[PDB]
């Protein structure tokens, strides 16, 4: 008989891969899920131009 | 910058690291504030509880 | 015709003070509002014993 201290997860699956992009000189990007719990997000840079 | 109808023009990184709770450039009802601990401090008391 | 980047808060009001604590040997304390994006929490150590 013991209390439960912490449960780790070793097998997980993601869903709802939604992204968002803004063009250079116009600041950063944002999504409403980056403030949402049970989600994971990453902001990065990409090659942009006329094409 | 707009604050209480008083407006200014602020430098690049001086506005980035303003030590205040903040939310990004997307407005929705009941916004998510980041780094709220900069305005809400709870440090120790004598003992037995923190305020 | 400009778009907002960041929105800092200079007047904040706190509400719904709550707490949960466990004794030294029993382990670390936890409260359900830790996972809420509208609550600020803090874990600290306080005196405990027969008293």
């Amino acid at each position, epitope marked *: 008989n013991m209390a439960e201290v912490r449960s780790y997860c070793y097998e997980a699956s993601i869903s709802d*891969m939604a992204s*968002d*992009s*803004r063009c250079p000189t*116009q600041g950063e990007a944002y999504l409403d899920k980056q403030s949402d719990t049970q989600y994971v997000c990453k902001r990065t840079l990409v090659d942009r131009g006329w094409g | 910058l707009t604050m209480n109808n008083k407006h200014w023009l602020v430098h690049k990184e001086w506005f980035h690291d303003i030590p205040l709770p903040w939310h990004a450039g*997307a*407005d929705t*009802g009941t916004p998510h504030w980041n780094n709220k601990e900069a305005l809400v401090e709870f440090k120790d008391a004598h003992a037995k509880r923190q305020t | *015709n*400009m778009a907002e980047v960041r929105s800092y808060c200079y007047e904040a009001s706190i509400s719904d003070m709550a707490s949960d604590s466990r004794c030294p040997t029993q382990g670390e304390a936890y409260l359900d509002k830790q996972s809420d994006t509208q609550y600020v929490c803090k874990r600290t150590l306080v005196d405990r014993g027969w008293g």
Partner: antibody
Framework: VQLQESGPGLVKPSETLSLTCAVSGYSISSGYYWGWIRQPPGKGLEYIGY????????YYNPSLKSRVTISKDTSKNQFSLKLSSVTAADTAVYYCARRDRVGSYPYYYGLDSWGQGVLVTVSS | SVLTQPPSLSASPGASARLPCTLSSDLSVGSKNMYWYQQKPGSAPRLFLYYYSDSDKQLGPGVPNRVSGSKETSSNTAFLLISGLQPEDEADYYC??????????FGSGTKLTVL
């Protein structure tokens, strides 16, 4: 990138209605979002949802909480839609569409490729 | 959340047609990716113009450069400007965005009529 939608013409009230479109010229298991958008003639556009070609995730209209269920068949390269327990007011023209949500140059977020349309009525 | 649209529009051939699309009070037009679809009866709505800013904008396939976009954040309304009105463009236009939970919200349908 042809999209070919087809299905029955009349579904009876309080019955599960279903429509399907085949992606004639692009594999589903590549990332794009495939969805349904309906509108009665003369009324504004209203989306039903979209299904993923990669994971199978589905997210629909808030009004149709448990009414719709978008089906899929990746191997045959088709994706379906099963609006369960339809009502009499659901009479509208339905459209098959493809969009993207995974960051491919935001223009593609809006539904760029559409179908032809299927007129559906609920009568007795 | 819903977007308002004008039902009636009339303009002379060769003028600049302004098509407004007013977002609701819960949305800021400056930070939303606007999408514009064109639809004539008997045809599925083709994607006409995407606009977010004058440096972030993408036209449709085979759409002349006389189709531009603009935003007025004072009144919180997105625009669809078509200069040099040719008869082939007369149709009904729609605007669309995606809100917090990625739900598409369309408009009422702007009935464009060139005199």
């Amino acid at each position: 990138v042809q999209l070919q939608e087809s299905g029955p013409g009349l579904v009876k009230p309080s019955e599960t209605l279903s429509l399907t479109c085949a992606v004639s010229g692009y594999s589903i298991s590549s990332g794009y979002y495939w969805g349904w958008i309906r509108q009665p003639p003369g009324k504004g556009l209203e989306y039903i949802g979209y299904i993923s070609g990669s994971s199978g995730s589905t997210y629909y209209n808030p009004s149709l909480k448990s009414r719709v269920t978008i089906s899929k068949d990746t191997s045959k390269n088709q994706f379906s839609l099963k609006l369960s327990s339809v009502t009499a007011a659901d009479t509208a023209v339905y459209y098959c569409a493809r969009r993207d949500r995974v960051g491919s140059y935001p223009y593609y977020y809006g539904l760029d490729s559409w179908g032809q349309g299927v007129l559906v009525t609920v009568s007795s | 959340s819903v977007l308002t649209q004008p039902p009636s529009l009339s303009a002379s051939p060769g003028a600049s047609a302004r098509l407004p699309c007013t977002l609701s009070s819960d949305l800021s037009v400056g930070s939303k990716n606007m999408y514009w679809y064109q639809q004539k009866p008997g045809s599925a709505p083709r994607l006409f113009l995407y606009y977010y800013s004058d440096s972030d904008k993408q036209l449709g396939p085979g759409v002349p450069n006389r189709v531009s976009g603009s935003k007025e954040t004072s009144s919180n309304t997105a625009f669809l400007l078509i200069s040099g009105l040719q008869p082939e463009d007369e149709a009904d236009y729609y605007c669309q965005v995606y809100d917090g939970s990625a739900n598409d919200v369309f408009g009422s349908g702007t009935k464009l009529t060139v005199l």
